Structures are given as structure tokens and as C-alpha cells.
Amino acid sequence: AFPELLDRVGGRGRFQLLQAVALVTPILWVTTQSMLENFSAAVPHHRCWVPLLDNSGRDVLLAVSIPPGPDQRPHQCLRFRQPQWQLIADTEPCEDGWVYDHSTFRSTIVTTWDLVCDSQALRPMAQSIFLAGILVGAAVCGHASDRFGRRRVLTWSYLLVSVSGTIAALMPTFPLYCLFRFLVASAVAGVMMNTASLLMEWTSAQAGPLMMTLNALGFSFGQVLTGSVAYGVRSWRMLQLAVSAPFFLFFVYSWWLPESARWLITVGRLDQSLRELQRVAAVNRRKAEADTLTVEVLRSAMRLRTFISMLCWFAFGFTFFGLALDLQALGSNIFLLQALIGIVDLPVKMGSLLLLSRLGRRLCQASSLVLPGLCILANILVPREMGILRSSLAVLGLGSLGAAFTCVTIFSSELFPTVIRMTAVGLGQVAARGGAMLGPLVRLLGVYGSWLPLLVYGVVPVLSGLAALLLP
Ligand SMILES: CC(C)(Sc1ccncc1-c1ccc(C#N)c2ccccc12)C(=O)O
């Protein structure tokens, strides 16, 4: 009887739009704390400290103390025991600290904790830890909102994000920074899950397409917001503070939004449900049918396809979260990137969807994975002087991968006995989230050659997409 009550109280109107505007804005900043691990842990050019240079012909002094490296650069991990003045065999690891290049970034976490050379694996692990935190927090919060409400959990998760972010920028050692970020990730996952549930709960009929389109648009704009904010603040201790502070301001205003009116009924909190419904009616201005509500009415109210979807979600999560966090290897000008991604994404997603869906439902699913995977794979062959071509290929690949989610979210999930889609989208989301903690771990394989990470990162989407043609 809840849909009839919602029709009696509203639908579309004013409040159902103010709630969307008030809830979408936190998603922009939520995106900022997931892709922030691209301007915070940025690796500049690091050389070895020398007693000759850098105080107790600059070019000759640099050439005599540091042996030449393989990639046409001074060596980043070794120095000469004694100035080899024979240069008009014996090398010792750096023992006086590195010297970094401060020309685009002032202080990253790499600069402050020397995560270079031998201690290199720790950098692709500080991201897998965050994704494991998101995975854990997206599973714990599921069993903590059906008993504590759907609005209180969001309000407290805002405060948790704010406090954990404001603390994580003031730690003196790596292990604690790898734990407070875990807490931030769990709280962010809770925020996203509850925002989606609240967005759908209050809306009917015109709820499926538009509201879930709004969330994807929010993420796409959050990417541009991340780029713009990173363009301004250059340090890393003043970036986490500036990104985590707005969540406290969101927490204060989050005390006025009404709670879900469908959860209040199944628990017996009829009186407050009535208060919430009448309050919503006044904002919606449809204060004509609300006189009907007199407690009693609310008292009466109170396999192959599945595996294919599993693999598609896993491939999307794997490739996207392994590629979007290393944009220093897809080209240059990191600030210009991370902003063209969303601007490409929205036109690309809309235009690709509109044209391809007319071919068929399976064709759109197939062409949204093979195309970006092949675009990424065809990036190795390009020589390292056509910067525009490789940058365009990478941007197109990421934009198409972003569109794959939408093309597999509301267009897909029908490939089942077709009762309701929240018993399948939620199952796919656990695979998508569990396919990202196995993400940046592939980037640990930069040794044994450097082409292999990109090769795997392009092959996996291609095989996953080509397996979708085997539906029967
Ligand atoms: C776990 C995923 C699949 S990814 C995600 C997790 C945490 N924070 C942000 C995103 C995210 C990033 C870029 C997107 C794009 N384009 C996007 C689109 C839809 C949903 C999430 C994202 C989810 O959240 O379902």
C-alpha cells in the first residue's frame, strides 16, 4: 500500500527534487577521496644525495658522482663511493636520503616517507588497502542500517568521513596512514550505499532511470572536481584537510532531511512516519489528500547469465580501478587529465548508448568492453613521441569503460526471471567491489618488464567482453 500512499502524498514535485540536489552534492566530494591517490602520492624524479653537489660545472659534477641509468636518466638508486674523476663496478645504495624534484608538487607522501627504490611495493599497496576498506565497509553497513534507520547512518557516516579525513592528514608514520584511510574508505562506502537507497526509496514510477542516472552524473562531475581542486592546493597535508572539511558542513545540514517513510512502517514507528509524511506534504504543496492519513491506513499498510554479469562487473572494476589511479604512466599533464575523463564520459556514454542500443541489447554490452580494452591494448605499440595520439587513446578507453557501467546497470540486470532488479544489481556490486582490491596489485609487476601490466590490463576486458557473445 506504500505506492498508493506515495501517490497520495506526492511524486516528482518540489521535495523529491530538493532531496536529490541535497544528496547528489556529497557524491562529488566522495569521488574526490577515492581518486585523490593520484596527486597525493605522486612520484617525482629522485636522485641520490651527494656530498659534492647539494652543498656539504654542475653538469660535470652530476655526471661524475651518479652512474648513468638505463632510461636516459641519471641513476635513481645508486651513487659512486668516491668521485670517479677518471670520467672526463663499485656502487653503494643511497644512505643519506634522496633528493627529489620540486617543480610541480611540493610534498607528496613519497617525499615525506621515502617510498622509492627498495621500498617501492608499499605504494601500490596503500591503494589496495583503501579498496579493501571500501569492500569491508560496503558489507558491514548493510546489516547496520536495517536496524538503525536509513537517515541516521548517513548522518553519522558524514561525521566519520570528516573526522577520519581530518586525522589522517596529521600522522607521522606510514602504518597509521594506512589505517585511517581504511576507516575513511569504509565510511565512504556506507555513505554511497545509503545515499542510493534513500534516493530510490522516496521515489516511484519515475525512479529507475533518472535517479540512477543522477548518481553516475555525480561521479563524472566529481572527477572534474578532483582535477580542479588538485590544481589549486599542491601539498598533501593541506589537500586532505581541504577535501575532508566539507563533509562536516554536510553533516550539520543533514539533520533536516526526512527519513525513509517505508522503513518506518515495517518497524512500528507509525507516529513518526505520519509526521514525516505530513511534513513532506507541506513542502510538496499537495496538502489536499494528506487529510486522509489517520493512522489506520498506515496500520493496514504495515545461471549462465548470472556468471556473465559476474565476469563483466569484475572486468570493469579490475580495469577501471587499476588504470585510473596511475595516470602518470598514461601520458603527461596530470591536472589536465582527471578532468577530461568526465567531460569525455558524459557525451561518450550518451552517444554510444543511443546509437548502439538500437542494434540490440547484447550488442551494446559487447561493444562497451571490447572497444575500450582494444583501445588500451593498442597503446603499447605507439612510440613515445606521438603524445596526442596515446593520450587520446587512453582518454577514450577510460571514458568508454565508465560508460560500460551504465550500459550494464539499467540496460542489463533484466537477464533473469525478471521479478525485481535489486536482487541482482546488489549481487553484481559485490563482485565489482571485490574485483578492485585485486586491482593495483597488478601494477606491482612493473619488474620483469613494464609492458606486461598494460598488456594484462587490456587483455582482461577484451576476453571478458568477447565471452558475453557466448550467452546461449
Ligand atoms: C565499486 C563501484 C563499482 S566504483 C566506485 C567506488 C567508490 N567510489 C567511486 C566509484 C566510481 C568511480 C567512477 C565512476 C564512473 N564513471 C563510477 C560510476 C558509477 C559508480 C561508481 C563509480 C561502485 O561504486 O559501484
From Swiss-Prot:
Keyword Transmembrane: yes
Compartmental location: Apical cell membrane
Main location: membrane
Catalysed transformations (reactions): urate(out) + (S)-lactate(in) = urate(in) + (S)-lactate(out); nicotinate(in) + urate(out) = nicotinate(out) + urate(in); urate(out) + n chloride(in) = urate(in) + n chloride(out); orotate(out) + nicotinate(in) = orotate(in) + nicotinate(out)
Segments passing through the bilayer: 15-35, 124-144, 160-180, 182-202, 210-230, 238-258, 307-327, 334-354, 363-383, 391-411, 422-442, 451-471
Gene Ontology molecular function: PDZ domain binding; urate transmembrane transporter activity
Matches recorded under Pfam families: Sugar_tr
GO BP of this protein: cellular response to insulin stimulus; monoatomic ion transport; organic anion transport; renal urate salt excretion; response to xenobiotic stimulus; urate metabolic process; urate transport
Residues listed as glycosylation sites in the UniProt record: N55
Domain of life: Eukaryota
InterPro entries on file: MFS_dom, MFS_sugar_transport-like, MFS_trans_sf
UniProt topology in membrane: Multi-pass membrane protein
Post-translational modification (record): N-glycosylated.
Tissue and organ expression note: Expressed in the proximal tubular epithelial cells in kidney.
GO cellular component: apical plasma membrane; brush border membrane; membrane; plasma membrane
Keyword annotations of the record: Cell membrane, Glycoprotein, Ion transport, Membrane, Phosphoprotein, Transmembrane, Transmembrane helix, Transport
The protein's assembly and partners: Interacts with PDZK1.
Family membership: Belongs to the major facilitator (TC 2.A.1) superfamily. Organic cation transporter (TC 2.A.1.19) family.
Function: Electroneutral antiporter that translocates urate across the apical membrane of proximal tubular cells in exchange for monovalent organic or inorganic anions. Involved in renal reabsorption of urate and helps maintaining blood levels of uric acid. Mediates urate uptake by an exchange with organic anions such as (S)-lactate and nicotinate, and inorganic anion Cl(-). Other inorganic anions such as Br(-), I(-) and NO3(-) may also act as counteranions that exchange for urate.
Protein name in UniProt: Solute carrier family 22 member 12
